[PDB]
Design a protein around this motif. Structure first.
Motif, short mmCIF file in Angstrom:
data_model
loop_
_atom_site.label_atom_id
_atom_site.label_comp_id
_atom_site.label_asym_id
_atom_site.label_seq_id
_atom_site.Cartn_x
_atom_site.Cartn_y
_atom_site.Cartn_z
N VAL A 142 26.21 -18.11 -25.84
CA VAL A 142 26.38 -18.91 -24.81
C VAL A 142 27.97 -19.01 -24.36
CG1 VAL A 142 25.96 -20.81 -23.30
CG2 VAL A 142 24.18 -19.91 -24.76
N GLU A 143 28.52 -18.47 -23.28
CA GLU A 143 29.84 -18.62 -22.83
C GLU A 143 30.27 -19.69 -21.83
OE1 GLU A 143 30.64 -14.51 -21.75
OE2 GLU A 143 31.53 -14.12 -23.81
N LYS A 144 29.09 -20.12 -21.23
CA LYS A 144 29.71 -20.97 -19.90
C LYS A 144 27.92 -21.65 -19.43
CE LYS A 144 32.23 -21.94 -15.74
NZ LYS A 144 33.10 -22.82 -16.45
N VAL A 145 27.76 -22.67 -19.19
CA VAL A 145 26.69 -23.34 -18.73
C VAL A 145 27.08 -24.38 -17.53
CG1 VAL A 145 24.68 -24.70 -19.12
CG2 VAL A 145 25.88 -23.55 -21.08
N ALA A 146 26.15 -24.08 -16.43
CA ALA A 146 26.28 -24.80 -15.24
C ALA A 146 25.12 -25.26 -14.60
CB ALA A 146 27.09 -23.84 -13.90
N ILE A 147 25.16 -26.55 -14.40
CA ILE A 147 23.95 -27.35 -13.94
C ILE A 147 24.04 -27.34 -12.25
CG2 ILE A 147 22.71 -29.60 -13.93
CD1 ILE A 147 23.89 -29.98 -16.51
N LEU A 148 23.48 -26.71 -11.72
CA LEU A 148 23.75 -26.39 -10.30
C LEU A 148 23.06 -27.60 -9.59
CD1 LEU A 148 23.70 -22.72 -9.97
CD2 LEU A 148 25.52 -24.11 -10.27
N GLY A 149 21.88 -27.87 -10.08
CA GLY A 149 20.99 -29.05 -9.52
C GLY A 149 19.92 -28.37 -8.24
N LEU A 150 19.57 -29.28 -7.49
CA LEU A 150 18.72 -28.83 -6.42
C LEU A 150 18.93 -28.16 -5.45
CD1 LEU A 150 16.86 -32.49 -6.22
CD2 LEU A 150 15.90 -30.57 -7.37
N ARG A 151 17.95 -26.92 -4.92
CA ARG A 151 18.46 -25.95 -3.92
C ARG A 151 17.08 -26.06 -3.26
NH1 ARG A 151 22.31 -21.16 -6.01
NH2 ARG A 151 22.35 -21.00 -3.87
N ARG A 152 17.16 -25.35 -2.09
CA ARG A 152 15.95 -24.93 -1.33
C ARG A 152 15.67 -23.61 -1.73
NH1 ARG A 152 15.78 -26.12 5.00
NH2 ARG A 152 15.43 -28.02 4.15
N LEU A 153 14.33 -23.26 -2.12
CA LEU A 153 13.93 -21.56 -2.46
C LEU A 153 14.00 -20.98 -1.52
CD1 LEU A 153 11.49 -22.66 -5.37
CD2 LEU A 153 13.94 -22.40 -5.58
N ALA A 154 14.18 -19.53 -1.62
CA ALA A 154 14.13 -18.43 -0.62
C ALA A 154 12.57 -18.59 -0.15
CB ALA A 154 14.31 -16.98 -1.39
N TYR A 155 11.65 -19.10 -0.93
CA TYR A 155 10.30 -19.47 -0.64
C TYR A 155 9.69 -20.15 -1.80
CZ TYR A 155 9.62 -15.73 -4.50
OH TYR A 155 10.01 -15.13 -5.63
N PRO A 156 8.80 -21.10 -1.31
CA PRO A 156 8.05 -21.77 -2.32
C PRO A 156 7.51 -21.53 -3.52
CG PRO A 156 6.73 -21.72 -0.37
CD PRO A 156 8.06 -20.99 -0.14
N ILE A 157 7.76 -21.97 -4.27
CA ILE A 157 7.03 -21.60 -5.90
C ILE A 157 6.16 -22.83 -6.60
CG2 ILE A 157 7.19 -20.75 -8.35
CD1 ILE A 157 10.08 -19.60 -7.34
N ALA A 158 4.95 -22.63 -6.69
CA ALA A 158 4.00 -23.50 -7.19
C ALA A 158 3.93 -24.82 -6.11
CB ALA A 158 4.55 -24.05 -8.58
N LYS A 159 3.75 -24.34 -4.72
CA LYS A 159 3.62 -25.41 -3.81
C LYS A 159 4.95 -26.22 -3.73
CE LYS A 159 -0.32 -24.16 -2.70
NZ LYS A 159 -1.60 -25.33 -2.96
#
Length: 98
Positions: free
Chosen positions: A37-54
């Motif tokens: 692992v060279e780098k890690v980023a916690i991007l957080g909440l984003r609206r999905l292209a399409y809903p997954i698991a409701k």
């Protein structure tokens, strides 16, 4: 060894404690499948292209790693097995971070 970007989307309803567990499991998987692992980023909440698991939103995690190409598929499968992992997308690094 090849450089990839591992994009992971988690259940947006997890508390920081459950979130940490998933990240720790992801970290173990990366190490277990030979990734550096060279780098890690916690991007957080984003609206999905399409809903997954409701759920229309997802919690995003990003990793830049170097790992054997013959283990990427297995790694992705291992990560997707988690009930709280909504999506796993591994792509070849095009513009790696130094």
């Amino acid at each position: 060894m090849r450089r990839y970007e591992v994009n992971i989307v988690l259940n947006p309803n997890l508390d920081q404690s459950q979130l940490a567990l998933e990240k720790e499991i992801i970290q173990r998987a990366l190490e277990n499948y030979g990734a550096r692992v060279e780098k890690v980023a916690i991007l957080g909440l984003r609206r999905l292209a399409y809903p997954i698991a409701k759920d229309p939103q997802g919690y995003f995690l990003w990793y830049q790693v170097e790992m054997p190409e013959d283990r990427v598929n297995d790694l992705a499968r291992e990560l997707r097995i988690r009930d709280n992992v909504r999506r796993v997308m591994v792509v070849k690094s095009q513009e790696p971070f130094l």
